[PDB]
Write an enzyme that holds these catalytic residues in place. Structure first.
Site, PDB file in Angstrom:
ATOM      1  N   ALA A   1      -6.666  -1.349   7.118  1.00  0.00           N
ATOM      2  CA  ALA A   1      -6.205  -0.055   7.281  1.00  0.00           C
ATOM      3  C   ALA A   1      -6.229   0.598   6.022  1.00  0.00           C
ATOM      4  CB  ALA A   1      -4.905  -0.128   8.200  1.00  0.00           C
TER       5      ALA A   1
ATOM      6  N   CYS B   1      -7.276   2.834  13.994  1.00  0.00           N
ATOM      7  CA  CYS B   1      -7.502   1.412  15.017  1.00  0.00           C
ATOM      8  C   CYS B   1      -8.225   0.518  14.144  1.00  0.00           C
ATOM      9  CB  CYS B   1      -8.067   2.093  16.168  1.00  0.00           C
ATOM     10  SG  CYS B   1      -8.363   0.480  17.332  1.00  0.00           S
ATOM     11  N   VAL B   2      -7.764  -0.699  14.035  1.00  0.00           N
ATOM     12  CA  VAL B   2      -8.459  -1.807  13.519  1.00  0.00           C
ATOM     13  C   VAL B   2      -8.751  -2.793  14.580  1.00  0.00           C
ATOM     14  CG1 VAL B   2      -8.504  -3.829  11.887  1.00  0.00           C
ATOM     15  CG2 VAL B   2      -7.894  -1.515  11.065  1.00  0.00           C
TER      16      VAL B   2
ATOM     17  N   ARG C   1      -5.910  -6.149   5.478  1.00  0.00           N
ATOM     18  CA  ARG C   1      -5.926  -5.094   4.648  1.00  0.00           C
ATOM     19  C   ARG C   1      -6.960  -4.063   4.822  1.00  0.00           C
ATOM     20  NH1 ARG C   1      -0.629  -5.430   3.828  1.00  0.00           N
ATOM     21  NH2 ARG C   1      -0.768  -3.824   1.910  1.00  0.00           N
TER      22      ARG C   1
ATOM     23  N   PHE D   1       0.848  -1.371  -0.009  1.00  0.00           N
ATOM     24  CA  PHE D   1       0.038  -0.053  -0.034  1.00  0.00           C
ATOM     25  C   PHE D   1       0.746   1.207  -0.178  1.00  0.00           C
ATOM     26  CE2 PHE D   1      -1.581   3.459   2.676  1.00  0.00           C
ATOM     27  CZ  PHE D   1      -2.957   3.677   1.964  1.00  0.00           C
ATOM     28  N   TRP D   2       1.705   1.489   0.891  1.00  0.00           N
ATOM     29  CA  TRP D   2       2.643   2.956   0.831  1.00  0.00           C
ATOM     30  C   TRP D   2       3.388   3.020  -0.424  1.00  0.00           C
ATOM     31  CZ3 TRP D   2       1.058   6.543   3.394  1.00  0.00           C
ATOM     32  CH2 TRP D   2       0.340   6.606   4.481  1.00  0.00           C
TER      33      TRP D   2
ATOM     34  N   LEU E   1      -2.005  14.894  20.313  1.00  0.00           N
ATOM     35  CA  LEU E   1      -2.580  14.264  21.403  1.00  0.00           C
ATOM     36  C   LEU E   1      -2.979  12.688  21.319  1.00  0.00           C
ATOM     37  CD1 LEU E   1      -5.629  16.841  21.551  1.00  0.00           C
ATOM     38  CD2 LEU E   1      -3.719  16.730  22.872  1.00  0.00           C
TER      39      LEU E   1
HETATM   40  C1  MYA Z   1      -4.734  14.573   2.273  1.00  0.00           C
HETATM   41  C2  MYA Z   1      -5.408  13.731   3.513  1.00  0.00           C
HETATM   42  C3  MYA Z   1      -4.672  12.380   3.696  1.00  0.00           C
HETATM   43  C4  MYA Z   1      -5.272  11.651   4.875  1.00  0.00           C
HETATM   44  C5  MYA Z   1      -4.618  10.262   5.230  1.00  0.00           C
HETATM   45  C6  MYA Z   1      -3.062  10.641   5.501  1.00  0.00           C
HETATM   46  C7  MYA Z   1      -2.363   9.014   5.988  1.00  0.00           C
HETATM   47  C8  MYA Z   1      -2.593   8.833   7.201  1.00  0.00           C
HETATM   48  C9  MYA Z   1      -1.825   7.334   7.489  1.00  0.00           C
HETATM   49  C10 MYA Z   1      -2.134   6.918   8.827  1.00  0.00           C
HETATM   50  C11 MYA Z   1      -1.656   7.556  10.446  1.00  0.00           C
HETATM   51  C12 MYA Z   1      -2.022   6.874  11.394  1.00  0.00           C
HETATM   52  C13 MYA Z   1      -1.541   7.718  12.733  1.00  0.00           C
HETATM   53  C14 MYA Z   1      -1.855   6.786  13.912  1.00  0.00           C
HETATM   54  O1  MYA Z   1      -2.927   6.694  14.556  1.00  0.00           O
HETATM   55  S1  MYA Z   1      -0.837   5.757  14.558  1.00  0.00           S
HETATM   56  C15 MYA Z   1      -1.399   4.604  15.741  1.00  0.00           C
HETATM   57  C16 MYA Z   1      -1.766   3.355  14.902  1.00  0.00           C
HETATM   58  N1  MYA Z   1      -2.731   2.458  15.649  1.00  0.00           N
HETATM   59  C17 MYA Z   1      -2.264   1.511  16.343  1.00  0.00           C
HETATM   60  O2  MYA Z   1      -1.066   1.163  16.370  1.00  0.00           O
HETATM   61  C18 MYA Z   1      -3.340   0.821  16.950  1.00  0.00           C
HETATM   62  C19 MYA Z   1      -3.221  -0.895  17.083  1.00  0.00           C
HETATM   63  N2  MYA Z   1      -2.853  -1.328  15.761  1.00  0.00           N
HETATM   64  C20 MYA Z   1      -4.063  -1.458  14.972  1.00  0.00           C
HETATM   65  O3  MYA Z   1      -5.134  -1.031  15.038  1.00  0.00           O
HETATM   66  C21 MYA Z   1      -3.599  -1.976  13.570  1.00  0.00           C
HETATM   67  O4  MYA Z   1      -2.432  -2.827  13.788  1.00  0.00           O
HETATM   68  C22 MYA Z   1      -3.320  -1.081  12.460  1.00  0.00           C
HETATM   69  C23 MYA Z   1      -4.663  -0.126  11.971  1.00  0.00           C
HETATM   70  C24 MYA Z   1      -2.121   0.059  12.961  1.00  0.00           C
HETATM   71  C25 MYA Z   1      -2.967  -1.693  11.095  1.00  0.00           C
HETATM   72  O5  MYA Z   1      -3.842  -2.574  10.846  1.00  0.00           O
HETATM   73  P1  MYA Z   1      -3.398  -4.249  10.316  1.00  0.00           P
HETATM   74  O6  MYA Z   1      -2.369  -4.524  11.284  1.00  0.00           O
HETATM   75  O7  MYA Z   1      -4.592  -5.011  10.504  1.00  0.00           O
HETATM   76  O8  MYA Z   1      -3.001  -4.174   9.028  1.00  0.00           O
HETATM   77  P2  MYA Z   1      -3.664  -4.169   7.599  1.00  0.00           P
HETATM   78  O9  MYA Z   1      -3.571  -5.606   7.017  1.00  0.00           O
HETATM   79  O10 MYA Z   1      -5.100  -3.771   7.670  1.00  0.00           O
HETATM   80  O11 MYA Z   1      -2.796  -3.188   6.656  1.00  0.00           O
HETATM   81  C26 MYA Z   1      -1.477  -3.216   6.373  1.00  0.00           C
HETATM   82  C27 MYA Z   1      -0.829  -1.817   6.033  1.00  0.00           C
HETATM   83  O12 MYA Z   1      -0.976  -1.024   6.918  1.00  0.00           O
HETATM   84  C28 MYA Z   1       0.212  -0.236   7.216  1.00  0.00           C
HETATM   85  N3  MYA Z   1       0.457   0.273   8.543  1.00  0.00           N
HETATM   86  C29 MYA Z   1       0.644  -0.497   9.508  1.00  0.00           C
HETATM   87  N4  MYA Z   1       0.616   0.543  10.646  1.00  0.00           N
HETATM   88  C30 MYA Z   1       0.268   1.473  10.142  1.00  0.00           C
HETATM   89  C31 MYA Z   1       0.335   2.945  10.898  1.00  0.00           C
HETATM   90  N5  MYA Z   1       0.289   3.143  12.353  1.00  0.00           N
HETATM   91  N6  MYA Z   1       0.001   3.816  10.108  1.00  0.00           N
HETATM   92  C32 MYA Z   1       0.071   3.819   8.740  1.00  0.00           C
HETATM   93  N7  MYA Z   1       0.110   2.725   8.137  1.00  0.00           N
HETATM   94  C33 MYA Z   1       0.375   1.829   8.715  1.00  0.00           C
HETATM   95  C34 MYA Z   1       1.190  -1.303   7.031  1.00  0.00           C
HETATM   96  O13 MYA Z   1       2.480  -0.817   6.604  1.00  0.00           O
HETATM   97  C35 MYA Z   1       0.487  -1.959   5.720  1.00  0.00           C
HETATM   98  O14 MYA Z   1       0.992  -1.312   4.410  1.00  0.00           O
HETATM   99  P3  MYA Z   1       2.274  -1.910   3.476  1.00  0.00           P
HETATM  100  O15 MYA Z   1       3.328  -1.864   4.275  1.00  0.00           O
HETATM  101  O16 MYA Z   1       1.812  -3.206   3.146  1.00  0.00           O
HETATM  102  O17 MYA Z   1       2.331  -0.707   2.203  1.00  0.00           O
HETATM  103 MG    MG Z   2      -6.886  -5.325   8.617  1.00  0.00          MG
END
Ligand code: MYA
Ligand code: MG
Length: 411
Positions: A171, A160-161, A169, A4-5, A411
């Site tokens: 997130a 948060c998922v 996938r 994804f990234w 925050l």
């Molecule tokens: C112009 C406006 C733009 C708006 C958006 C701007 C961007 C905002 C971006 C978000 C800023 C958030 C800021 C905060 O809140 S950071 C706090 C994040 N929350 C947690 O750590 C809570 C506990 N964990 C979870 O809830 C899940 O493990 C999460 C949701 C983190 C991933 O769910 P899961 O573990 O079930 O995985 P997947 O199979 O669905 O998805 C895998 C893909 O996710 C990529 N990944 C993993 N962790 C993160 C992370 N912290 N930021 C971004 N991406 C992350 C990972 O490299 C992979 O991509 P790739 O490596 O294959 O490419």
């Molecule tokens: Mg997931």
């Protein structure tokens, strides 16, 4: 490596980041009418939901998701327990956009499975000082100044998922739908932080911790009795002694902030935050919202001399659940928020923060080494922890900066 990234408008490696010399966008200039008007596709057993931040149940739903599934330390001993009152404060600043708060529910029972929040922020994010100097040297000052004006962007938090849906996938789908909703409002950058390394931070720093109730921190294994306190006949009384604090603030003139303080706190904070490369611009309404005291959530004190506010500090509360301990369920932590000192050394301002937090029942004071926080670590007995906070932009090239050049508290 990043399915994804690698598809997103962010710097892909450190090597690429070290080449960036000017601030500015990464992606195709796009316009609002180009963005899909329909929500991103999602599987038929789920639905998108926009919580109503004025609804107590909706805030409760989000609260329970995060209490059971949000971020833990790396050993799975502590998980954040943001309160309902804190989430209403953090999610609903002046002129917040309800549609920037994005959730997925299971369509059957309306179980909240996933959440991400966006709020407005006005950020200075032009080329940083050290880079503007190299620009002058090459005769490229105009390119370097192009994006100096503070920009109205999106700050993302609380992704948060649910633990049962991890690594499916979900997130990336939530991130794409937030991006869509934000781009539909003509905003094209975001700022976010994470404890984990993703492509690619513009700044990183350690967390620091100041023990206020060391006997509890030791009991819950937040900290230990350090090996050196072994040459001593009695290790804990010595640890309490080490971290003891006065019962009352030492600055005469300190009091809680009240509404009539807002324009003076705005001026002194905005003047201080100009000394950093990346930092927020707040209106009077945004100073009121983020800094006026709210019980259990945010705590703010000013130093008043000759009926003028000359300094202030703020801290916010985030308890953590202690994952199984027989004596304690909760770690009560205070986090250093914004501050400004003009009459006294910063260490003497922030000692009174520690005194107030300790008398209000906090167990630890936490901060990241942003702002001038490194200037009071040693005298105020902060110690580095095991975590880091990394700062990122979406769709913005930015030269690497030290965390002491970052003035955005998240925050
Ligand atoms: C112009 C406006 C733009 C708006 C958006 C701007 C961007 C905002 C971006 C978000 C800023 C958030 C800021 C905060 O809140 S950071 C706090 C994040 N929350 C947690 O750590 C809570 C506990 N964990 C979870 O809830 C899940 O493990 C999460 C949701 C983190 C991933 O769910 P899961 O573990 O079930 O995985 P997947 O199979 O669905 O998805 C895998 C893909 O996710 C990529 N990944 C993993 N962790 C993160 C992370 N912290 N930021 C971004 N991406 C992350 C990972 O490299 C992979 O991509 P790739 O490596 O294959 O490419
Ligand atoms: Mg997931």
């Amino acid at each position: 490596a990043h399915a994804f990234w690698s598809t997103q408008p962010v710097p892909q490696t450190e090597d690429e980041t070290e080449k960036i010399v000017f601030a500015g966008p990464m992606d195709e200039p796009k316009t609002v009418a180009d963005i899909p008007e329909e929500p991103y596709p999602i599987a038929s057993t789920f639905e998108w939901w926009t919580p109503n931040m004025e609804a107590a149940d909706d805030i409760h739903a989000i609260y329970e998701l995060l209490r059971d599934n949000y971020v833990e330390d790396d050993d799975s001993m502590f998980r954040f327990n943001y309160s309902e009152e804190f989430l209403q404060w953090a999610l609903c600043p002046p002129n917040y956009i309800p549609d920037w708060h994005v959730a997925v529910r299971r369509k059957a029972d309306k179980k909240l499975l996933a959440f991400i929040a966006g709020v407005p922020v006005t950020l200075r994010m032009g080329t940083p000082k050290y880079m503007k100097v190299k620009a002058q040297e090459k005769g490229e000052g105009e390119e370097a100044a192009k994006y100096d004006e503070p920009r109205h962007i999106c700050e993302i938090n609380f992704l948060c998922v649910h633990k049962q849906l991890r690594e499916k996938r979900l997130a990336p789908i939530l991130i794409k739908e937030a991006t869509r909703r934000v781009n539909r409002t003509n905003v094209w950058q975001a700022v976010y932080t994470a404890g984990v390394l993703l492509p690619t931070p513009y700044a990183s720093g350690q967390y620091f911790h100041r023990s206020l109730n060391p006997e509890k921190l030791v009991e819950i294994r937040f900290s230990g009795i350090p090996a050196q306190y072994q040459k001593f006949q009695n290790p804990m009384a010595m640890l309490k002694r080490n971290y003891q604090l006065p019962s009352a603030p030492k600055n005469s003139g300190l009091r809680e902030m009240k509404p009539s303080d807002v324009p003076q706190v705005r001026r002194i904070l905005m003047n201080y935050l100009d000394s950093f490369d990346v930092g927020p611009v707040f209106s009077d309404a945004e100073i009121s919202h983020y800094l006026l005291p709210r019980d259990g959530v945010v705590f703010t004190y000013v130093v008043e001399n000759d009926k003028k506010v000359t300094d202030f500090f703020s801290f916010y509360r985030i308890p953590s659940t202690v994952i199984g301990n027989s004596n304690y369920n909760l770690l009560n932590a205070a986090y250093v928020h914004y501050y400004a000192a003009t009459s006294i050394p910063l260490h003497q301002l922030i000692l009174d923060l520690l005194i107030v937090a300790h008398s209000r029942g906090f167990d630890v004071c936490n901060m990241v080494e942003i702002l001038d926080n490194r200037s009071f670590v040693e005298q105020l007995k902060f110690g580095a922890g095991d975590g880091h906070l990394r700062y990122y932009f979406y769709n913005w090239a930015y030269p690497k900066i030290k965390p002491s050049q970052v003035a955005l508290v998240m925050l």
